[PDB]
Amino acid sequence: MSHNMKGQKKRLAKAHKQNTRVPVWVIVKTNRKVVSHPRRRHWRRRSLDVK
Amino acid sequence: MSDLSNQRKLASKVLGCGLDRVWLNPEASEEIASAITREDIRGLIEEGTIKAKPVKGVSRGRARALAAKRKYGHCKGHGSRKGKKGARTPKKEQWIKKIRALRRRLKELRADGALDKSVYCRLYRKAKGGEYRSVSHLNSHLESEKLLKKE
């Protein structure tokens, strides 16, 4: 239970909501040309450089 | 049945016991699988489908028999002693009880008129000097020397 300030937790929240798959409708719209993005990660890996 | 693991965890929280203390009825498995909320688990608990198994303590009866024998002075010989003489009876505690008994005896003897201040002072210093093994030894010295102001 490390203790974050408001901004550190906001940056963690942004990192968390960035770690989502591309929407299926985006894949349909681009005709399978956009299927991923570079901000995918896993929590148990090389950590965030955010906080 | 699919996993009843959620129900078991919820029931251990509701019952306040460990996870393996929780007993789920192996016959009422589908009834348990429908229980999602703390209220459903409470209903199953009240109707006996889910209960907490008895804690299996550590019985202490044979320790009680051994402790009674040890109180009588048995099962405590040299082949049973493992700690140093001093870890089993610390020496400062021995001295403390000895000197306190002797001093209380002398104080009561001086109070109840059996001992005047002059000999009380010397007896008190003698007790401080380890001259008497116990209260009985001190009383025996008193009666042999006739230091008590008998009437």
Partner: protein
């Protein structure tokens, strides 16, 4: 205690925080300076000619 993997378990802290000015995690928490942009040392942006090659 080995200088290798064993001593690397004590890595539960930081020497550089996130920089207000530039966003780089280069703000030395002891010297109170950003080693990337120079924030906390100068009102200007840290730049050196040796950050590139001699343009010839």
């Amino acid at each position: 205690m080995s200088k290798g993997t064993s001593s690397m378990g004590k890595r539960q802290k930081r020497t550089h925080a996130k920089c207000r000015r530039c966003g780089s995690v280069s703000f030395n928490v002891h010297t109170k300076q950003c080693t990337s942009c120079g924030f906390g040392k100068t009102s200007r942006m840290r730049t050196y000619k040796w950050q590139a090659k001699c343009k010839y």
